[PDB]
Amino acid sequence: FNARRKLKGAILTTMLATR
Amino acid sequence: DQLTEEQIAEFKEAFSLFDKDGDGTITTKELGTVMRSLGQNPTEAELQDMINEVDADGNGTIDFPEFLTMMARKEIREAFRVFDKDGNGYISAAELRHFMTNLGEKLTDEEVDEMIREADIDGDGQVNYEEFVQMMT
Ligand SMILES: [Ca+2]
Ligand SMILES: [Ca+2]
Ligand SMILES: [Ca+2]
Ligand SMILES: [Ca+2]
């Protein structure tokens, strides 16, 4: 498990989805 | 300049949260569904334009090499507010767990805690805005 990948990947999705 | 393997794996994780059916491409409908679930309301024209701006080979969907091209070429506060559901300025483990299962993800308690610990700089066991910003910058 890569905690940084999972967290930053989810934050980058939120940033994209909220433009 | 460079792209590390860690940076590519993060872009790959992000791509996979949009690719809801796991078929290797993001459609307008998958984008629409994710954006609505995070509180946005794109029109059909906006969803089609967004896919078109990223769809470099023109087949009408986004694959990871196209997604990587856009992410390498490119509001952290508005994202922080998605995670900080009660708006008290601190992302708790419970809030992160909740945000992650609403994305359809399967996580253990230890896993959520490992993510809190990764972002937690001062060590109070929560993630404030400054720690959120430092994670992404
Ligand atoms: Ca798909
Ligand atoms: Ca394409
Ligand atoms: Ca909170
Ligand atoms: Ca903290």
Author numbering:
A (entry chain B): 293 to 311
B (entry chain A): 2 to 75, 84 to 146
Quote the original article.
In this study, we genetically incorporated the unnatural amino acid p-azido-phenylalanine (AzF) in different positions of CaM to exploit the azido stretching mode as a probe of local changes in the chemical environment of AzF in various CaM/CaMBD-complexes by IR-spectroscopy.
We further determined the crystal structure of AzF-labelled calmodulin in complex with a peptide from calmodulin-dependent protein kinase IIα, providing a structural explanation of the IR shifts observed upon binding. Our crystallographic structure refinement shows that the introduced AzF side chain at position 108 points towards the P2 peptide as clearly shown in the electron density. The azido group is in para-position of AzF108 and interacts with the backbone carbonyl oxygen of Ala302 and the side chain carbonyl oxygen of Thr306 of the bound peptide via dipole-dipole interactions and shows a moderate solvent accessibility [Figs. 4(b) and 4(e)]. The introduction of the AzF label also leads to a conformational change in the Asn111 side chain (compared to the wild-type complex). The position of AzF in the complex structure would sterically clash with the position of Asn111 in the wild-type structure. Thus, the side chain of Asn111 needs to rotate out off the core in the CaM108AzF+P2 complex structure, opening the space between helices H2, H5, and H6 and thus allowing solvent access to the azido group [Figs. 4(d)–4(f)]. We conclude that the dipole-dipole interactions of the azido group with the carbonyl oxygens in AzF108 provide an electrostatic environment that is responsible for the observed shift and change in the lineshape of the azido stretching band. We consider this particular structural motif to be responsible for the characteristically narrower lineshape of the azido stretching band.
